[PDB]
Design a protein around this ligand. Structure first.
Ligand SMILES: OC[C@H]1O[C@@](CO)(O[C@H]2O[C@H](CO)[C@@H](O)[C@H](O)[C@H]2O)[C@@H](O)[C@@H]1O
Ligand SMILES: Cc1cn([C@@H]2CC[C@H](OC(C(=O)O)C(=O)O)C2)c(=O)[nH]c1=O
Ligand SMILES: [Mg+2]
Ligand SMILES: [Mg+2]
Lengths: 554, 416
DNA sequence: TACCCCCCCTTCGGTGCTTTGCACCGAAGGGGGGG
């Protein structure tokens, strides 16, 4: 005699009605197994039979559990989905083993047939109506409505999930020295109790749950490590991922690389040093899923290096709130960074990677800051605190960067870890004009219609150059002119442009760019000894600005 | 047995649907304790996933305060709720407040928990407390009473509020009082001693209503009478290099969008040749008057630049380096209502993000006192950087609107 | 021929200043993972 879980009032989106979508054809084998499952639910009280008065139907289908003989019932409630009220999802994130503390006694249980143990809202039941073909469209078939949460309805996860939390509520308040991680129906329960008093609490937990109609089959009652949980394996002092299966295939498509690149992402959380840049590049293009793609010399080099990491089996440790957190980052080249979070040397809680390339033109310092930001945020999710950082950048480098950059930037408490390759600034523009360096007034223009252009400069010692350009734009020519100035000058040079665009890019000290021309300019800047860039408004009759503007407009 | 004042959102608008951001351990613990005590007192009640609305929540410590204070980011809800100006509920703004010698800011949001909130409106105040490592699904509450941080609450509470201060006002008719959100602005020309004295009187006075019909005791002391303006200034030199004059001309040509009478013809002439940036060049007789004439123009105020109460305020901030930050407040481009500069704020030489947070709070406070409005900020910082750290440094009970810009400084315009 | 969550990598259209090109960013659609 169960205490039934009070229902949750659910409405449809205003002035929309119920679904009326008739069943798509069922191949013969399909028609049968479905019929027996229906009859079952009716006996259990999970589904009511009525159908003259409910005008509605939603298509039904069924697919098997993975590696199981059994068949699982699915509803195509997607039409109902568009028409149903919105929900606020109470599931905000995924628990991570590296956030758990060590427990003396641990249990893992699954509630059995979860959605079907929680009563759908009384008034809403009629829209769940569906129709199943009795014998391949000979006679009408049977109508049914759901009495519990049906799989496929957008409100089923949130509603089950919230009810589950209200059910566990009194058990938690009156057992504050137990820990229960609820992620849908799968429960982890840990205590610093004697395995005797623990097995008791578990059974008390199972009782309270059954009092509300929640079964916990023994078949799902893991009692001995290694605990299978959230795709991980929990041992008493270390965790790791459930085995990663990497395809070793000789022919690679797009879809193989997506699957391949995805699995490595998932592996990066504990197997340190994972790289996916080259493999992901092999993916960039309108390339459809079927088209086959040969790897690059440098690309299958990456794939090979990854395997070497995945050969060993790696494991993380668990969290000790009494010890500091430590995050350590290494530069991996081409905008790749990895990190490790740990509290004692070589006992990593977890690892990860940041490789996002944001901006056409960037540098390592920005990317490291972004990586710091990713790690800081991830940490607040898992442990609720910010780690101390160990970073491959000289204190002086950071000081020069953040104090001189025109945007506000910052990195929390950190210390230098001398692990090459170090992050550094590759050049610095002077703050004041350089005495005894040649002044180059640069400008560039293109014709919007011809897309033909010129770039050049005039100099205070009389030196001049103009270069004709084909298939170009205003902004390209402006960069080009600065390049010519840098190419044709000595080691110390003053440059005067009127390109707001050009000065913007160069002043953020990029060290890498999507533009071949910008990299060429970057490459010139690194070789110089002193460079002073100066902006003047165009068309205000200044300097060589008017003298070079008439060269490259005519 | 008090009857709730109905409140409606703007026609053709849904409620807020803003995702909760991750919270540090200390903030969640403070929030769980605070929400527990509030639920026991009927102020909030537990809700489910069938309410589709959400407003982010977090927690702060005010300046020099050791006790955590709940803060709801009601920015979304506030911009979707009926303006009460149309209703005629809205509070008028006293032009005299900015003129007083001392203005103390008192947190009085606590008063608002006394007043029931309209049943049909409660669902819009839904928030979700998160948990470390997602041990639990989010725990959703909604408000039953007037919530701190909602623009509807001072509106609806004004009647009781005017009645409470009524005695104090008649006794001390020289003292200015302005209510903005959860804060009370109390200004006087008294000497400092009697000012703090009078503030204590008003506070004990507040206790007498509290017995009868985060904490109330705190108070921050402003001095609006001494608020400087940072105007545009040209350098003073006896010898100018080509570079210096190029900077000056670019600056003057930029300024001309603000002061139209500025001229650069005579100055531009000194740059005719293709000369070395480092070369010293004498100003022509014509050029010196032009420079002097421009200094005169920059000394006087811009024409036809006045506050329009129906338009929003905008604030731009520039990082000048070495701990100096400049700002301008405007409603229309190049018609600045105020310009200014801050230096040596908390975080100088170590933390840009703390400094900018202080700057934003300082500017907002000035905007509330001067116009009774909070500006929308254009922040010189990448979005991800800002969103990661600002709540560590936030000390105010309101949150201004903001957006992100990236404007490299080509002219050193507001700072020399 | 289903649902809800989180993640990374890419593409693409909308937006606003670098302007009629170019840079940034969020959404969406691919993959990984969970129940
Ligand atoms: O930083 C802006 C960023 O925050 C979000 C997420 O909650 O929205 C908040 O900030 C906005 C900017 O002021 C407000 O307009 C909004 O109401 C508030 O919830 C994102 O929407 C936005 O990108
Ligand atoms: C895998 C899967 C699960 N679910 C539900 C989530 C909670 C319920 O739990 C299960 C149970 O029935 O016991 C379960 O323990 O796995 C089933 C779906 O809706 N769609 C799905 O593809
Ligand atoms: Mg189960
Ligand atoms: Mg030109």
């Amino acid at each position: 005699p169960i205490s039934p879980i009070e229902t949750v009032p659910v409405k449809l989106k205003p002035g929309m009605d119920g679904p009326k979508v008739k069943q798509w054809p069922l191949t013969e084998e399909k028609i049968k197994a479905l019929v027996e499952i229906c009859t079952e639910m009716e006996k259990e009280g999970k589904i009511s039979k009525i159908g003259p008065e409910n005008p509605y139907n939603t298509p039904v289908f069924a697919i098997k559990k993975k590696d199981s003989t059994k068949w699982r019932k699915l509803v195509d409630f997607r039409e109902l989905n568009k028409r149903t009220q919105d929900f606020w999802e109470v599931q905000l994130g995924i628990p991570h083993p590296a956030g758990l503390k060590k427990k003396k006694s641990v249990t893992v249980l699954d509630v059995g047939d979860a959605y079907f143990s929680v009563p759908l809202d009384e008034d809403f039941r009629k829209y769940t109506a569906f129709t199943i073909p009795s014998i391949n469209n000979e006679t009408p078939g049977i109508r049914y409505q759901y009495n519990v949460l049906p799989q496929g309805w957008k409100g089923s996860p949130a509603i089950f999930q919230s009810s589950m939390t209200k059910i566990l509520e009194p058990f938690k308040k009156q057992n504050p020295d137990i820990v229960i991680y609820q992620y849908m129906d799968d429960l982890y329960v840990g205590s610093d109790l004697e395995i005797g008093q623990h097995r008791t609490k578990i059974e008390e937990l199972r009782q309270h749950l059954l009092r509300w109609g929640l079964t916990t089959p023994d078949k799902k009652h893991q009692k001995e490590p290694p605990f299978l949980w959230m795709g991980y394996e929990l041992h008493p002092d270390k965790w790791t991922v459930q085995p990663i299966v990497l395809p070793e295939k000789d022919s690679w498509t797009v879809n193989d690389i997506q699957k391949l690149v995805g699995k490595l992402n998932w592996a990066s959380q504990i197997y340190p040093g994972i790289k996916v840049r080259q493999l992901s590049k092999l993916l960039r293009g309108t390339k459809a899923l079927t088209e086959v793609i040969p790897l690059t010399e440098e690309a299958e080099l990456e794939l090979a290096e990854n395997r070497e990491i995945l050969k060993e089996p790696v494991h993380g440790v668990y969290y000790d709130p009494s010890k500091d957190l430590i995050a350590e980052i290494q530069k991996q080249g081409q905008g790749q960074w990895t990190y490790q979070i740990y509290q004692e040397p070589f006992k990593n809680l977890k690892t990860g990677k940041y490789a996002r390339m944001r901006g056409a033109h960037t540098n390592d310092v920005k990317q490291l800051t972004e990586a710091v930001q990713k790690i800081t945020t991830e940490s607040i999710v898992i442990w609720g605190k910010t780690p101390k950082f160990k970073l491959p950048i000289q204190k002086e480098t950071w000081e020069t960067w953040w104090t001189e950059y025109w945007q506000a930037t910052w990195i929390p408490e950190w210390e230098f870890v001398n692990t090459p390759p170090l992050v550094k600034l590759w050049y610095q523009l002077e703050k004041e004009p350089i005495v005894g360096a040649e002044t180059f007034y640069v400008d560039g223009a293109a014709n919007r219609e011809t897309k033909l252009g010129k770039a050049g400069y005039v100099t205070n010692k009389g030196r001049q150059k103009v270069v004709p350009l084909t298939n170009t734009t205003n902004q390209k020519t402006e960069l080009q002119a600065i390049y010519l100035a840098l190419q044709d000058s000595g080691l110390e040079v003053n440059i005067v442009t009127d390109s707001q665009y050009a000065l913007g890019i160069i002043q953020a000290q990029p060290d890498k760019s999507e533009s071949e021309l910008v990299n060429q300019i970057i490459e010139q800047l690194i070789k110089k000894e002193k460079v002073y860039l100066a902006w003047v408004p165009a068309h205000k009759g200044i300097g060589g600005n008017e003298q070079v503007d008439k060269l490259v407009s005519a | 047995p008090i009857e709730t004042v109905p409140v409606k959102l703007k026609p053709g608008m849904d409620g807020p649907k803003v995702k909760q951001w991750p919270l540090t351990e200390e903030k969640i613990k403070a929030l769980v304790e605070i929400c527990t005590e509030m639920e026991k007192e009927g102020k909030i009640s537990k809700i489910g996933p069938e309410n589709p609305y959400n407003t982010p929540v977090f927690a702060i410590k005010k300046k020099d305060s050791t006790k955590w204070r709940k803060l709801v980011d009601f920015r979304e809800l506030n911009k979707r709720t009926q303006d009460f100006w149309e209703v005629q509920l809205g509070i008028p703004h006293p032009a005299g407040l900015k003129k007083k010698k001392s203005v103390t800011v008192l947190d009085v949001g606590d008063a608002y928990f006394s007043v029931p909130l309209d049943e049909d409106f409660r669902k819009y105040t839904a928030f979700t407390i998160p948990s470390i490592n997602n041990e639990t699904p989010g725990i959703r509450y909604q408000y039953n009473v007037l919530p701190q941080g909602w623009k509807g609450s001072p509106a609806i509470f004004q009647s009781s509020m005017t009645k409470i201060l009524e005695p104090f006002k008649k006794q001390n008719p020289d003292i200015v009082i302005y209510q903005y959100m959860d804060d009370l602005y109390v200004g006087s020309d008294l000497e400092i001693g009697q000012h703090r004295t009078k503030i204590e009187e008003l506070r004990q006075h507040l206790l007498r209503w509290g017995l009868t019909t985060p904490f109330l005791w705190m108070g921050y002391e402003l001095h609006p009478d001494k608020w400087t303006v940072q105007p545009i200034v040209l350098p003073e030199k006896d010898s100018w290099t080509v570079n210096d004059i190029q900077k000056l001309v670019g600056k003057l040509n930029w300024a001309s969008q603000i002061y139209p009478g500025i001229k650069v013809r005579q100055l531009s002439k000194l740059l005719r040749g293709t000369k070395a940036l480092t070369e010293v060049i004498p100003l022509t007789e014509e050029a010196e008057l032009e420079l002097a004439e421009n200094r005169e123009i920059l000394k006087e105020p811009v024409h036809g630049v006045y506050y329009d109460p129906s338009k929003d305020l905008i604030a731009e901030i520039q990082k000048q380096g070495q701990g100096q930050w400049t700002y301008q407040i405007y409603q229309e481009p190049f018609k600045n209502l105020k310009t200014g500069k801050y230096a040596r704020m908390r975080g100088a030489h170590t933390n840009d993000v703390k400094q900018l947070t202080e700057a934003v709070q300082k500017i907002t406070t000035e905007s509330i006192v001067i116009w009774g409005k909070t500006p929308k900020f254009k922040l010189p910082i990448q979005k991800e950087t800002w969103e990661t750290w600002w709540t560590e440094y936030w000390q105010a009970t309101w949150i201004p609107e903001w957006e992100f810009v990236n404007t490299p400084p080509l002219v050193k315009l507001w700072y020399q």
